[PDB]
Design a protein around this ligand. Structure first.
Ligand SMILES: Nc1ncnc2c1ncn2[C@@H]1O[C@H](COP(=O)(O)CP(=O)(O)OP(=O)(O)O)[C@@H](O)[C@H]1O
Ligand SMILES: O=C(O)c1ccccc1O
Ligand SMILES: [Mg+2]
Length: 541
């Protein structure tokens, strides 16, 4: 009752609260070096739109680094920057207004969920929530990933006491920095209290999959812990030791025999549903690139709804999905006007404007969002493309389409098409030194097996094919990847060895581009013919 009303109020005078919100942001911030440079000496919208440039991270990074290294927040924000968010790797400024906003959305999405999902209030979530450790900055302020700034905060520790915030995992397991340990412990605790599990998931679908893969590879050992009442010794985190011990409590040979039997069936089909029969849905994002995990999650889960709830970034949370048990391709996020002041740059002829406000976007037009927040970012380009699909009252509904500049992404890692071409060029110089000359390049992401990875097709005085000289390539291609990438390749254990598949098959593919539609090389049916044109495969290590 209150819900329908709250959401009605919130989607209705959108123009208003967005101006009021702009007002709240700018006014204190006439005090900042950054706004003083653009002559913003009072609150004025048009003046703001006139003088404040629309920027990218590179443009403002010189400001953000000064705060990173210890200058006053006031260079960019009059609200103290109390920390940073990690996406080299980039650092967005951050304060508790992010957590105010995040928890507002958590509360809003829980209301949406129970409104659509029968019987969720009568159990616990097995959530694979992970705390990653903070880098420190010279200013002395921590840098954390988005969810981690939430966990290492009282917004989590003192979170509401009710179904949506009740997990089968003690908080020590969620807050453990070693995710190898804590993923195991998630699975152990979830198994021990398996009847109470009415939902499961993670922030993104790749973690759901990795969790099911760890389960497949660790179930024997999980049951031995359940049999003995003892956690496996290798888990060192003291918090996991004590807390997951109280959960085990004692020997459970009976419950171990029970789960051993479910796992031992021929097929892993619907294994999730068989170990956790009261599960009603999987709460994990499967929009954007994450949609490629849908077939394999539907395999393991027996076509349980995959609910994608939220759209968000380090700049801001944008909004939520108000039709949660719809299909991934049909998902739209209804931006929430109390988060940040949103603007939008048209990306098709549908909107011939230079830039437009939230309440001004046109139906069926595509746009790159533009964020102004409560932590020092002003008119910052987000680098997503969204499509306007509809309107809840006066609040628009967006399809997430694409990330403006990417080639491949198999997890947390974002490998821009520039950091991708940092390999087509990079390792080539050493093919050059031995009697080889590169021909072409193009990348794909494989989800044939877990862990997926990056697919890459490359092109007298002998007989077989050279290995020593060209297996180095793949291993020095990787060295060109980002930090967020490598982390997942090894420590998250979410990606395998990178690889190349040797295939004049790109003067041939060039005709496979006029065949369906001046033409320059691409960043990411097509494959059946390209798949064929290969003679060998190699690994890096
Ligand atoms: N529900 C969702 N659906 C589809 N994409 C989502 C999403 N939630 C987040 N994302 C994607 O993840 C991005 C925000 O993540 P961040 O926390 O900023 C790490 P990043 O993507 O590496 O940032 P960067 O590419 O700007 O450096 C969004 O731009 C969006 O592209
Ligand atoms: O669940 C979250 O906290 C979240 C945060 C950022 C982006 C998407 C999300 O679901
Ligand atoms: Mg960005």
């Amino acid at each position: 009752e209150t819900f329908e009303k709250q959401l009605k109020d919130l989607t209705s005078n959108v123009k208003s609260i967005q101006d009021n919100l702009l007002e709240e942001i700018i006014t204190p911030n006439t005090k900042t070096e950054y706004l003083q440079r653009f002559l913003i000496d009072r609150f004025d919208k048009e003046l703001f739109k006139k003088n404040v440039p629309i920027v990218s991270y590179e443009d403002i990074k010189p400001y953000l680094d000064r705060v990173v290294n210890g200058e006053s927040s006031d260079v960019i924000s009059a609200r103290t920057i109390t920390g940073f968010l990690l996406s080299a790797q980039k650092m967005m400024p951050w304060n508790n207004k992010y957590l105010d906003n995040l928890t507002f959305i958590y509360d809003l999405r829980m209301q949406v969920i129970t409104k659509h999902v029968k019987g969720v209030e009568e159990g616990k979530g097995m959530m694979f929530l992970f705390t990653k450790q903070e880098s420190m900055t010279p200013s002395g302020l921590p840098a954390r990933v988005a969810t981690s700034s939430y966990f290492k905060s009282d917004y989590f520790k003192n979170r509401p006491s009710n179904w949506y915030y009740s997990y089968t995992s003690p908080d020590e397991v969620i807050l453990c920095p070693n995710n190898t340990e804590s993923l195991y412990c998630h699975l152990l605790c979830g198994l021990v209290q398996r009847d109470e599990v009415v939902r499961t998931g993670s922030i993104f679908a790749s973690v759901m999959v990795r969790a099911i893969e760890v389960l497949k590879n660790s179930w024997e050992e999980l049951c031995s812990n359940i049999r003995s009442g003892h956690l496996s010794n290798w888990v060192t985190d003291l918090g996991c030791q004590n807390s997951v011990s109280l959960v085990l409590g004692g020997p459970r040979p009976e419950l171990a025999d029970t789960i051993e039997e479910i796992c031992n069936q021929n097929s892993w089909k619907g294994i999730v549903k068989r170990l956790w029969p009261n599960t009603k849905y999987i709460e994990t994002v499967v929009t954007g690139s994450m949609g490629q995990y849908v077939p394999m999650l539907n395999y393991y889960c027996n076509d349980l709804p995959l609910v994608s709830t939220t759209y968000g970034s380090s700049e801001t949370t944008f909004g939520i999905n108000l039709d949660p048990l719809c299909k991934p391709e049909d998902v739209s996020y209804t931006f929430m006007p109390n988060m940040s002041y949103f603007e939008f740059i048209p990306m098709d002829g549908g909107d011939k404007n230079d830039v437009v406000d939230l309440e001004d976007v046109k139906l069926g037009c595509t746009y790159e969002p533009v964020v102004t927040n409560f932590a020092g970012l002003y008119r910052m380009r987000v680098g997503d493309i969204v499509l306007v699909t509809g309107f809840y009252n006066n609040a628009p509904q967006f399809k997430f389409v694409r990330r403006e500049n990417v080639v491949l992404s198999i997890d947390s890692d974002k490998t821009n098409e520039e950091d991708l071409f940092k390999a087509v060029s990079q390792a080539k110089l050493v093919l050059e030194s031995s009697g080889l000359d590169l021909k072409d390049f193009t990348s794909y992401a494989d989800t044939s097996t877990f862990p997926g990875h990056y697919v890459v097709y490359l092109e007298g005085e002998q007989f077989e094919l050279d290995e020593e000289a060209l297996s180095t390539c793949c291993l020095v291609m990787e060295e060109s990847l980002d930090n967020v990438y490598k982390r997942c390749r090894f420590k998250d254990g979410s990606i395998g060895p990178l690889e190349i598949r040797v295939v004049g098959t790109f003067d041939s593919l060039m005709d496979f581009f006029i065949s369906q539609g001046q033409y320059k090389t691409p960043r990411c049916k097509a494959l059946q013919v390209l798949e064929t044109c290969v003679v060998a495969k190699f690994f890096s290590i």
